[PDB]
Amino acid sequence: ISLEQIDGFAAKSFPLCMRQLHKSLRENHHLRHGGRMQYGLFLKGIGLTLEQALQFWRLEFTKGKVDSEKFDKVYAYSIRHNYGKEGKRTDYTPYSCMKVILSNPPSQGDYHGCPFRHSDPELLKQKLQSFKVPSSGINQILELVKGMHYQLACQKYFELTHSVDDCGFSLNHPNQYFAESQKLLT
Amino acid sequence: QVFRFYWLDAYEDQYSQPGVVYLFGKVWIESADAYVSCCVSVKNIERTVYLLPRENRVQLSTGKDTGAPVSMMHVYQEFNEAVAEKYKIMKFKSKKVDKDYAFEIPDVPASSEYLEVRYSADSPQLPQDLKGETFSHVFGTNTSSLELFLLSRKIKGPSWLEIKSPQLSSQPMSWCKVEAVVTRPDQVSVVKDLAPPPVVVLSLSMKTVQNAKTHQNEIVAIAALVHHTFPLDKAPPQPPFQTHFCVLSKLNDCIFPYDYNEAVKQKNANIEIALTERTLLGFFLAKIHKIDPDVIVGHDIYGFDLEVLLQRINSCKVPFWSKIGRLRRSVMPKLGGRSGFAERNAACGRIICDIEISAKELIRCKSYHLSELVHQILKAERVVIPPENIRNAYNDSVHLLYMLENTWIDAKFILQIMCELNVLPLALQITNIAGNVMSRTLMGGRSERNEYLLLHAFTENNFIVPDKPVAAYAGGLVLEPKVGFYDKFILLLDFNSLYPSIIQEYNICFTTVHREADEIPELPHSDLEMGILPREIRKLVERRRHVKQLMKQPDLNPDLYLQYDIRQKALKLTANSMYGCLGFSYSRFYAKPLAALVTHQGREILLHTKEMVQKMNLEVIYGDTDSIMINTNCNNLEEVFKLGNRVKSEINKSYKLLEIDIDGIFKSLLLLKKKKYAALTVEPTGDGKYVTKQELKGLDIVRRDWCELAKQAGNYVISQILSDQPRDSIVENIQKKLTEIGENVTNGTVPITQYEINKALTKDPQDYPDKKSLPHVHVALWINSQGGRKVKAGDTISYVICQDGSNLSASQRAYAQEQLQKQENLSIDTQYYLSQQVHPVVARICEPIDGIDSALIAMWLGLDPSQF
DNA sequence: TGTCGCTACAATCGCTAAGTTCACGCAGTATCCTGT
Ligand SMILES: Nc1nc2c(ncn2[C@H]2C[C@H](O)[C@@H](COP(=O)(O)OP(=O)(O)OP(=O)(O)O)O2)c(=O)[nH]1
């Protein structure tokens, strides 16, 4: 995968979770540990290489008026690890939607987790309105959310954004969302 | 018409019979050709006061000074009008009498005239703080009838008395054989220069079993020995006893063995078997009445024996209780109360001798229980029957007779101890010297003796003594010792009767020192005449000097020599107590300024003597308030004696009475600290031949609070150190002996008694606060917990610190020897002894010794040097 | 109810301060972590 197309994915292909993560990163050019771990694992899932992810993260973190030397000192080892390059050297797998729902709950200043689960209904409605989603689609997504159908709510988002009547797949992974989006688009 | 008798004891009841004193003694009746006890009731012993007039009349409330001179006529007028009416006193005799006074009541002139007034003791007693316009003080208000009588008739200790115009009592009042009533104190006189008559002495020992149902102590046997002609001025007779009687009873429920009667009959003794304790007490009282002994002797008689007797008399309701004394009464005195006052009053007219108190006063022993005294004085071994065996004795004739014979042997030992110490002659002598009653003297204590001595002295000199009272000052100087070991000759100089000699020389007296009611008053002027106290103390010192010179006679019976030594020590202590009672807060003659002056003069004398000896180019190494130790640095004894005589003459040259004599010559000395040294005292044998006798002062080896193992180890170590052996051999022998003792302790081969440690008691075991638990006190309580005679104050207790698995401090593991021998979970703490009884003493002893240190002692003891 | 005096040493208990442990922590640095 190429660094430039990551922006395109964040605009279109990324699920709302990774979409928010990318928006936060490009707004702040820094993610907390939880967000860094989640986003790195997702970028591993899409296919970004260790070198590509290291380069992209280095470049992004440098823009926050920080040394890239500090990045190489600290985040280099972590980026190595999350790709199973050091320590136990295990190819750590990207999180599934169930984990994201049941993963660490974000707090103030955090942006990880499933937005459908960790975003208040008003915030989710506002975000969906920002994305130009039809009012009926937004209402259906909200109804799915209220019954705790965050997987089904995300499938509704995928159906609405890709102009497809039925998702045709049981969304259980953000990278699975990425693969389905790429299949529909490309 | 005269009536001559030898009085021994006097009893007065301040409340029951006012102004009456009973004198009990012996009177010779020709018909019986022997002495018989007689009682004389001196009635109408009036009470006398003394009034001190004012210089000028003073308004009582305004506290004014009108200015009218106050003469004796005015004083009599005031006492006749105001006071006599106020206090309801009808008849009195008034006279003017000039008396002297020097004591602690401000604004009382040395000499003045008073209106001596006497009236019947039945009339009310004036208040001690009485005052009026015409008089500023009233004396003698609370004077006891006995004291008034004794001081009025100048009666000074037991002695022959002459009574004029005796009369007979309407009805019997005493249990004696002859009675006589004297109508006035003037009718009693004293006759001198006649030997005291022999008296009857009854020694009684009893065996009791406690009733744990009530914890009441019931008597089950009384072995009594009597001698009817015991002398009071000669040596004790041999054998001490003339005849004897034994009385034996049974318990409440138990019964006699089968053939007790046959065994008792075969015993051939004057045994009377009492069915019940009631019958036993009745028989005992009848026996006491028949013999009517004058001096009843016993062990713990004042604390245990008499109290038990009276308690059981009350419990069984034995009719005639007062027969235990010599007067007739009806209501027994209330028991309880401190001291033996209940006992003494119950036994009024009989001199009670407690060989425990007498032994405590006369000699010093590690323990005062009867067995230890018997082993020390009589050098005999006593078999002790445990109380369980006493209960079990009512099961066979053999054991019952063994118990009774043990009681008899205890009585015999008590009498033997009394005779050996020479308690009765010494009591008579000291009572005659002091002038008090003999029973009080035998009760112990120094305060009453000195108080009565000074009472007699001042009264005979026209003085008004003060009414009985209804580290406050510096002491002696101890020179800093030169601690070390001295192998050459040491010369010890000691002052002779230092404080008495100071009082004599400097004329210190109540009438010479102008005191002020903490500054030392000035020394009295040399112009004054000798005072009362110098005269009395001079008499005591002269008596002691006479006894000591008598001791110088060669070829004296060694036992008689020891008796003379005891008498000399008693006189020395009497003089020293005469000094000390000046500084006794509760004494009648509290003159703390005088005691402070005496001690200050002693310190000045010691400092001057040290300066003189040092100025002679002689080394000074020690001194304790009257003595000096000099290092002669010589090896020839003749030169040592020459130098001693030289220095003694030079020191004596500066004093009028004080004399310094050579106390001893030490061949070798080990000066450890103040009041702690051991020496090889040298006693010349003749022709240049001398014998060396060991002498220990103040060390731990001479203290009862250390295990006898430690005492033995220290004695051996000192013996090795003080010897002339080469130093290397001395150190080697010390190491070898210490290793041997360590092995013996580790292997348990030491006899168990060697682990005993003795500590006395200050109060009753209960009265001790919960200040953790003092070791002895702990064991003390256990003794009372068990079924045996309780342990009261001033009782030595031997405890052994033993392992119990408790992982607690040693202080809290004190155990009796019987406890260890009984319990199977208690074992002697070998490490404790090796580390805290053997090590500390030897380590302190060997401090100035080269080659020995704490680590080496621990190693040779087998201990770990780490902690040391 | 009476109960001589003071000086010196040793041992023990109580209370408290001085010191030690030593676990709180931190500032600095380092490695190795997470899921399917
Ligand atoms: N009050 C009182 N004073 C004592 C006692 N023991 C010693 N002193 C005082 C008074 C003695 O005169 C002084 C000197 O002690 P000493 O034992 O050498 O007796 P002292 O010199 O009087 O006679 P001595 O050397 O034995 O012939 O210490 C005592 O038990 N009570």
Ligand code: SF4
């Ligand atoms: S359902 Fe899955 S893909 Fe969709 S927002 Fe939640 S975690 Fe992301």
Ligand SMILES: [Mg+2]
């Ligand atoms: Mg971090």
Ligand SMILES: [Mg+2]
């Ligand atoms: Mg002396």
